Amino acid sequence: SVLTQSASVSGSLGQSVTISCTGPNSVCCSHKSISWYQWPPGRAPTLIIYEDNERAPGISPRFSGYKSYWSAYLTISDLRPEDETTYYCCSYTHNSGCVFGTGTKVSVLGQSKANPSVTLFPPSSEELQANKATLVCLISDFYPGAVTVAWKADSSPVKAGVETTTPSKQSNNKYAASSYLSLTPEQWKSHRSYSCQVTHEGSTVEKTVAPTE
Amino acid sequence: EGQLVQSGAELKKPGASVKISCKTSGYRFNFYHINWIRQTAGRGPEWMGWISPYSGDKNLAPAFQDRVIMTTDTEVPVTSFTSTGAAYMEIRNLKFDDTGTYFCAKGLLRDGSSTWLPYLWGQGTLLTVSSASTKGPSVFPLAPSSKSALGCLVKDYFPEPVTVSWNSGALTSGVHTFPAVLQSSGLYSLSSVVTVPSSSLGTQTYICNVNHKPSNTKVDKRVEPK
Amino acid sequence: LGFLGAAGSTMGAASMTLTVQARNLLSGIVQQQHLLKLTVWGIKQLQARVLAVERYLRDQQLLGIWGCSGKLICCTNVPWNSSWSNRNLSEIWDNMTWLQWDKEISNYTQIIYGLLEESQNQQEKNEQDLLALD
Amino acid sequence: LGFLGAAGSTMGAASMTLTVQARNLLSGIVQQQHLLKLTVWGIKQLQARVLAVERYLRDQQLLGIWGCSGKLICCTNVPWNSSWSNRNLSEIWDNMTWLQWDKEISNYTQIIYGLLEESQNQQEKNEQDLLALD
Amino acid sequence: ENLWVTVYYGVPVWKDAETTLFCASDAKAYETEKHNVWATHACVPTDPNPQEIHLENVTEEFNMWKNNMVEQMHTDIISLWDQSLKPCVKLTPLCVTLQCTNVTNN
Amino acid sequence: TVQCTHGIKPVVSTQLLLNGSLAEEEVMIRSENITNNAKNILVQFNTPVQINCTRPNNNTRKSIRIGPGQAFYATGDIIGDIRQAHCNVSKATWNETLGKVVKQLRKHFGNNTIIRFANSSGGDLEVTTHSFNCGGEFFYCNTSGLFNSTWISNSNDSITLPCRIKQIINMWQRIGQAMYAPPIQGVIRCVSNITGLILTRDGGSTNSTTETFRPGGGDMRDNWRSELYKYKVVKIEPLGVAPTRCKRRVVG
Ligand SMILES: *[C@@H]1O[C@H](CO[C@@H]2O[C@@H](C)[C@@H](O)[C@@H](O)[C@@H]2O)[C@@H](O[C@@H]2O[C@H](CO)[C@@H](O[C@@H]3O[C@H](CO[C@H]4O[C@H](CO)[C@@H](O)[C@H](O)[C@@H]4O[C@@H]4O[C@H](CO)[C@@H](O[C@@H]5O[C@H](CO)[C@H](O)[C@H](O)[C@H]5O)[C@H](O)[C@H]4NC(C)=O)[C@@H](O)[C@H](O[C@H]4O[C@H](CO)[C@@H](O)[C@H](O)[C@@H]4O)[C@@H]3O)[C@H](O)[C@H]2NC(C)=O)[C@H](O)[C@H]1NC(C)=O
Ligand SMILES: *[C@@H]1O[C@H](CO[C@@H]2O[C@@H](C)[C@@H](O)[C@@H](O)[C@@H]2O)[C@@H](O[C@@H]2O[C@H](CO)[C@@H](O[C@@H]3O[C@H](CO[C@H]4O[C@H](CO[C@H]5O[C@H](CO)[C@@H](O)[C@H](O)[C@@H]5O)[C@@H](O)[C@H](O)[C@@H]4O)[C@@H](O)[C@H](O[C@H]4O[C@H](CO)[C@@H](O)[C@H](O)[C@@H]4O[C@@H]4O[C@H](CO)[C@@H](O)[C@H](O)[C@H]4NC(C)=O)[C@@H]3O)[C@H](O)[C@H]2NC(C)=O)[C@H](O)[C@H]1NC(C)=O
Ligand SMILES: *[C@@H]1O[C@H](CO)[C@@H](O[C@@H]2O[C@H](CO)[C@@H](O[C@@H]3O[C@H](CO[C@H]4O[C@H](CO[C@H]5O[C@H](CO)[C@@H](O)[C@H](O)[C@@H]5O)[C@@H](O)[C@H](O)[C@@H]4O)[C@@H](O)[C@H](O[C@H]4O[C@H](CO)[C@@H](O)[C@H](O[C@H]5O[C@H](CO)[C@@H](O)[C@H](O)[C@@H]5O)[C@@H]4O)[C@@H]3O)[C@H](O)[C@H]2NC(C)=O)[C@H](O)[C@H]1NC(C)=O
Ligand SMILES: *[C@@H]1O[C@H](CO)[C@@H](O[C@@H]2O[C@H](CO)[C@@H](O[C@@H]3O[C@H](CO[C@H]4O[C@H](CO[C@H]5O[C@H](CO)[C@@H](O)[C@H](O)[C@@H]5O)[C@@H](O)[C@H](O[C@H]5O[C@H](CO)[C@@H](O)[C@H](O)[C@@H]5O)[C@@H]4O)[C@@H](O)[C@H](O[C@H]4O[C@H](CO)[C@@H](O)[C@H](O)[C@@H]4O)[C@@H]3O)[C@H](O)[C@H]2NC(C)=O)[C@H](O)[C@H]1NC(C)=O
Ligand SMILES: *[C@@H]1O[C@H](CO)[C@@H](O[C@@H]2O[C@H](CO)[C@@H](O[C@@H]3O[C@H](CO[C@H]4O[C@H](CO[C@H]5O[C@H](CO)[C@@H](O)[C@H](O)[C@@H]5O)[C@@H](O)[C@H](O)[C@@H]4O)[C@@H](O)[C@H](O[C@H]4O[C@H](CO)[C@@H](O)[C@H](O)[C@@H]4O)[C@@H]3O)[C@H](O)[C@H]2NC(C)=O)[C@H](O)[C@H]1NC(C)=O
Ligand SMILES: *[C@@H]1O[C@H](CO[C@@H]2O[C@@H](C)[C@@H](O)[C@@H](O)[C@@H]2O)[C@@H](O[C@@H]2O[C@H](CO)[C@@H](O[C@@H]3O[C@H](CO[C@H]4O[C@H](CO)[C@@H](O)[C@H](O)[C@@H]4O)[C@@H](O)[C@H](O)[C@@H]3O)[C@H](O)[C@H]2NC(C)=O)[C@H](O)[C@H]1NC(C)=O
Ligand SMILES: *[C@@H]1O[C@H](CO)[C@@H](O[C@@H]2O[C@H](CO)[C@@H](O[C@@H]3O[C@H](CO)[C@@H](O)[C@H](O)[C@@H]3O)[C@H](O)[C@H]2NC(C)=O)[C@H](O)[C@H]1NC(C)=O
Ligand SMILES: *[C@@H]1O[C@H](CO)[C@@H](O[C@@H]2O[C@H](CO)[C@@H](O)[C@H](O)[C@H]2NC(C)=O)[C@H](O)[C@H]1NC(C)=O
Ligand SMILES: *[C@@H]1O[C@H](CO)[C@@H](O)[C@H](O)[C@H]1NC(C)=O
Ligand SMILES: *[C@@H]1O[C@H](CO)[C@@H](O)[C@H](O)[C@H]1NC(C)=O
Ligand SMILES: *[C@@H]1O[C@H](CO)[C@@H](O)[C@H](O)[C@H]1NC(C)=O
């Protein structure tokens, strides 16, 4: 990529965050118009700033910007808890397409540390037919976007059973993730009782249920 | 103000050549340009080429002008200001570096200063250029532990997204969902929430169906009593 | 561009040649051209020529009380109310035909006309009371 | 004040809203709206519409040769002769309706018109011979 | 803010409506034959140069079975037929008891 | 946007339009309402069929003074044999036109039902026969001979039609005043292009199959619609307001 980005930038509620980007004279910021895009990773994208400072129809006038002889940027004023998503940018002349950036994964701190409503879902009578060993769990509204993979079989963490999965940003502008398991049926029958380990910053009140019954 | 929707969910072998399509509606298709972009496993999505439904004069990317070429037919006018058209694109060569999600988008404005950049985006198409063969997903119930938050389970499915998981479309408001997971084997799986108040089992239904394309779907399994 | 050439083009491009449209309409139709002359065609010709001038003069009477006696484009000192349209500078001029815009103000088009006579002429031609000779 | 609202009011107050009077007259009458159409009403409609524009255009032709193509109130560079009226500044404007004033100049009203064309236009548009390009 | 309003005389907008039209036909028969029932004795002659302009980007909705051009055409020809027959020989004393016989067919 | 229409001629015909306009493609089908069989259907010919009508009667102008100046022009004795009026139609050229019509009606009308072409059932002899003024006299050529053909699901002979002449007429059902047509002394020939067809209902068939459209031209206004299907007039409004930062002088 030949375009730049402000990389990971943070911010707080009711305040402003600036993300700059500059380029080389081939596809730089001098005398080449620019634009800025919103991009929830995996979801559908949106458009914010057109050409320079003129903002989108519909986009609140909270979004400011400017253009110097190389520095190009986006001043997002009065942050609201919906802005937490990666942003991008692309430079273009009149008759050319857009030359996109790299990615500024913007996170808005100052939020309220929420406690997720977490419960474990064990296998049923259909999983024992295929003998495939798997057990998962549900987390939602567990800000911040930090994860801790841990389980307890035989009162000790498993080395081959942990399956680290990708965390996602919930549609309610929060977070969501689930942990899976890949083991043999013999290891399920060999080790009966089970325990759930979720390293969550707080009090040790985690739900724990057994697979045999 | 004009909704654009992509075909979606097409996948083939690395040395293949597939075309994607985009249904337009709610805007005059003649002058608003069409362009395409792609996000890779890499962090940065890149721009492709912009086509004009009138005159056909196009300026595609230099790195894809040799292999990828796209055309677009005419339109059918609904009224004097609304119309529905379609845009296609064909790509000759591709590899695992060409796998990822593809979008189309409506041209910004019909004037001079800037037109080529997108405006309204579609729901998008995701393309897997993985050489492994397609497989049929497997269905499991996923029963709550402390019944003495609900959903159903999916285990071992090869590619893409299984999408909607609910029977009869009975509940669309208040149905949290969940994304996919990569396995050590490489065979994906996923799960789904549903937030409905706790009630009795005999009074209400506990059936959910998932749609598929790797192989067709048929059974909408339900949950075990205990 | 010989007449209505930019009927489907942008409001900006149509604003580049709006003289043409104005020229042809008043003049157009080549109206100029048994012993009787009481035929059904002559009576349809005369009344068609009456609305010709009585629709022209219906419009030309409005520009006269707006300071635009002999200008195709006046910029008027009346502020624009946001309720009439919420779209930005380049949002309408680079996107809509004049056809689309005519239906988007046809609801409150009369409200504009009444206000145009007040500030651009009813007050402006009065503001010279203290400035004409002093 | 919807029309002729100040017919009986002072010439000053009537001069505050004279736009209204002008707007309605040319436009007014809703002229726009067995198989024949040769009836006694249609012929009275057409000729009533002809004097509509031919009395409007009889007046609008005068303002054009007075520099007042699109102004409701021109101040003209013609000096006022004392013989036409002996009353002071605030004597007429704060006392007479326009009705009374129309009969007080109706005798020498034509003498004014002939002089208005000479100094405000016949000489003014000529005075640019030495000032246009030099 | 700080935007003003501006007037434009010569704008291309229109609304669906119908009014009176007129005839147009060039020099056809005049001397070799005249007194036509349709072109009357004189109509507004059309210019040999055809008035045509191609409109682009426009998609106006027409109508044919609701078009009023055929209505004025229907009613114009009717009033035109009667206008060309009023000054001609009336045949009222032709209604008398007719005594006829079949024609000569051997 | 044109100021003057094209050369529109007032062809006063019935069931079959003559001298009409057309601009290529399949034989166009137009209907105010396709599902309602009761409504009339206008049909346009991608190519015209050259037809010739004529009367063989050799008549003579017999002028008889009624009153002071007026003279009643009547028929004298017919010289040189007596014969019936007729209109020829190219038999080979007509079979191709009825085939192109049924083809484009097919995808319009189910493309599964049976074609039943019959004479103009019901009506009056002036509204069911191809009535038209030609050469002065008013012809009424028998239509019933053309639509006898039925085609469904996959120097040269020319069909002719018997015709009679009428002198007393008051067309378009105007009962106010009638007119006498003076017989045109001498020879008569018509030789016009046919370019349109007027077809009407096919009964109240309840589902099932089997139906077409037999000729009827009950209304005279529809005859002019075959030329004005593409024209519409609009009220130009030269006034249009739009905002822009832009103001004239402050005080004036
Ligand atoms: C309605 O129908 C019309 C068709 O009507 C046509 O009418 C005429 C003209 C004939 O062509 C007929 O055959 C047609 O019927 C359709 O109209 C088309 O709309 C298209 C989409 O809007 C439009 O497509 C593309 O426009 C791009 C942008 O234009 C440039 O330039 C204009 C004018 O200058 C400007 O307003 C633009 O914003 C944009 O940006 C400028 O670029 C120039 C050039 O680089 C810059 O100039 C530089 O200036 C500096 C000094 O300042 C220095 O001198 C440099 O050397 C100089 O280059 C300028 O600074 C930029 N800024 C400005 C001023 O804004 C075009 O780029 C693109 O070009 C392509 O096509 C061209 C035409 O063939 C080619 O020449 C070119 O190589 C490209 O291939 C497209 O034109 C169409 O142009 C437009 N009309 C045409 C010609 O078809 C319309 O779509 C339809 N619908 C509507 C909207 O109603
Ligand atoms: C369509 O219908 C019209 C109208 O016909 C109407 O009915 C007939 C009966 C007749 O009365 C018409 O006047 C009436 O309007 C047809 O047009 C007429 O067709 C008839 C057919 O017969 C013609 O009749 C013949 O007329 C011959 C000439 O008479 C004309 O002049 C008479 C006076 O002139 C006198 O002097 C001249 C010489 O200068 C003599 O030639 C003439 O005879 C007179 O002496 C005038 O009164 C007539 O109206 C007419 O204008 C006449 O010679 C013929 O009569 C002969 O010969 C017939 C066979 O050809 C025969 O059938 C008759 O019986 C008759 O024989 C005897 O002839 C004697 C001669 O002197 C006579 O004295 C005897 O009395 C007679 N015998 C008896 C008894 O009858 C015909 O009468 C008629 O001329 C046509 N119209 C005109 C111009 O008047 C039309 O043909 C029909 N269509 C068609 C195409 O068929
Ligand atoms: C749909 O379109 C078609 C298009 O074809 C329309 O069909 C027909 O199209 C024809 C195209 O040629 C039209 O033909 C014309 O016919 C007239 C007939 O007028 C004759 O009779 C008039 C009155 O009778 C007097 O004279 C006769 C002797 O003829 C006598 O017996 C009577 O007692 C009485 O005295 C005369 O005034 C007239 O002169 C003529 O005799 C004909 O006038 C047209 O003339 C052109 O063609 C002829 C023949 O080739 C040629 O001689 C003409 O040359 C020049 O010289 C003559 C003689 O001095 C002069 O009259 C001309 O003015 C020229 O200077 C000339 O080239 C022509 O033949 C036809 O009328 C038209 N309509 C018919 C009947 O169908 C069709 O009508 C349209 N749709 C429908 C169905 O309505
Ligand atoms: C415009 O022109 C059209 C031209 O068609 C005209 O239409 C005419 O309409 C009239 C009245 O509606 C018809 O009038 C009568 O039709 C009678 C019907 O035929 C009977 O007798 C049959 C034997 O006739 C032979 O010819 C007929 C054709 O007419 C033919 O079908 C037969 O096969 C046969 O060769 C008899 O066969 C028939 O029914 C039996 O057979 C049929 C066919 O196989 C079968 O389907 C049946 O199941 C049954 O077995 C029926 O019984 C006809 O008889 C009658 O007069 C005839 O004889 C007299 C006396 O000799 C002749 O002078 C006369 O010319 C006939 O030959 C009479 O014709 C008429 O048929 C239509 N067409 C014409 C002219 O033939 C329109 O009316 C015209 N429009 C206007 C303005 O008037
Ligand atoms: C071109 O124009 C034609 C005009 O006909 C359009 O054609 C349409 O065709 C459809 C064919 O199905 C018609 O559908 C039905 O029409 C019925 C007509 O109503 C008649 O009867 C009414 C009541 O009279 C008694 O009999 C009826 C029989 O159903 C009994 O139900 C009733 O109890 C009585 O005993 C009269 O009031 C009326 O005046 C008529 O005489 C409708 O009755 C019928 O209604 C049914 O469907 C309705 C719509 O779903 C529904 O709301 C009703 O409850 C009922 O189920 C149905 O409409 C169309 O009516 C007919 N259109 C018109 C204008 O009538 C054709 O669409 C158009 N061109 C196009 C677009 O192709
Ligand atoms: C231009 O303006 C007109 C009319 O507006 C008037 O004029 C302007 C200048 C202002 O002064 C307004 O205050 C005036 O009222 C707009 O017309 C509208 O058209 C639509 C579509 O035809 C009408 O919608 C109707 O909806 C009916 C159903 O009502 C439903 O909702 C009500 C309210 O909850 C509910 O009670 C009911 O049970 C229904 O659920 C329906 O039956 C009817 O057929 C029609 O569809 C609407 O009513 C009209 N306006 C008003 C307010 O009357 C134009 O849309 C506008 N155009 C633009 C471009 O602005
Ligand atoms: C329609 O009828 C008229 C009138 O009968 C025909 O006109 C006639 O045509 C002939 C053709 O030779 C003319 O020639 C000859 O005239 C002499 C002298 O009159 C006559 O003795 C011959 O027998 C022959 O008729 C004739 O003059 C002429 N007119 C008359 C008065 O008969 C006409 O030919 C017929 N149809 C058409 C248009 O051909
Ligand atoms: C008459 O119908 C047949 C089939 O009913 C038409 O053949 C094609 O059939 C397929 C499948 O039913 C349709 O999808 C096509 O649209 C049909 N062809 C077309 C172009 O319409 C047949 O074409 C029809 N008649 C004709 C000759 O048009
Ligand atoms: C754009 O529109 C908004 C309202 O939607 C308005 O507040 C803003 O001022 C407009 N932009 C400009 C150029 O003023
Ligand atoms: C003449 O024709 C009529 C037509 O109805 C007929 O009634 C009459 O008998 C016929 N007369 C002769 C003798 O031909
Ligand atoms: C009409 O007459 C012309 C004369 O040349 C002839 O060529 C044509 O075949 C005729 N058409 C018919 C079928 O009447």
Residue numbers in the entry:
A (entry chain E): 2 to 214
B (entry chain D): 1 to 52, 52A, 53 to 72, 72A, 72B, 72C, 72D, 72E, ...
C (entry chain B), D (entry chain B): 520 to 552, 564 to 664
E (entry chain G): 32 to 137
F (entry chain G): 244 to 306, 309 to 321, 321A, 322 to 398, 410 to 507
What does the paper say about this structure?
Subsequently, XFEL diffraction data collected by manually targeting individual crystals (~75 µm × 75 µm × 50 µm dimensions) improved intensities of high-angle Bragg reflections as previously observed for XFEL datasets, resulting in a 3.8 Å resolution structure of the BG18-BG505-35O22 complex from 520 still diffraction images. The XFEL dataset averaged diffraction data from approximately 400 crystals. Moreover, the improvement in resolution from 4.1 Å using conventional crystals to 3.8 Å resolution by exposing smaller crystal volumes using an XFEL offers the potential to examine natively glycosylated Env trimer–Fab structures to higher resolutions. N-glycans near the BG18 and 35O22 interfaces were modeled as mostly oligomannose (Man5-9GlcNAc2) in our structures to avoid over-interpretation of the electron density, except for complex-type glycans at positions N88gp120 and N156gp120, which were assigned as complex-type based on density for a core fucose in our 3.8 Å XFEL structure. In the BG18-BG505-35O22 structures, 17 N-linked glycans were modeled into ordered electron density, forming glycan arrays that extended ~22 Å from the Env surface. Indeed, the observed differences in the orientation of the BG18 Fab light chain on Env influenced the N332gp120 glycan conformation, as the glycan D1 arm reached in close proximity to CDRL2 and the gp120 GDIR motif in the BG18-BG505 complex, which differs from the interactions of the N332gp120 glycan D1 arm with light chain framework region 3 (FWRL3) in the 10-1074-BG505 complex. In addition to the BG18 interaction with the N332gp120 glycan, BG18 makes secondary interactions with the N392gp120, N386gp120, and N156gp120 glycans. The N392gp120 glycan threads between the BG18 cleft that is located between CDRH3 and CDRL1/L347, burying ~425 Å2 of Fab surface area against the glycan. Despite variability in V1 across HIV-1 Envs, we observed engagement of V1-loop protein components with BG18 CDRL2 and FWRL3 residues, accommodating the V1-loop into the nearby positively charged cleft formed by CDRH3, CDRL1/L2, and FWRL3 loops.
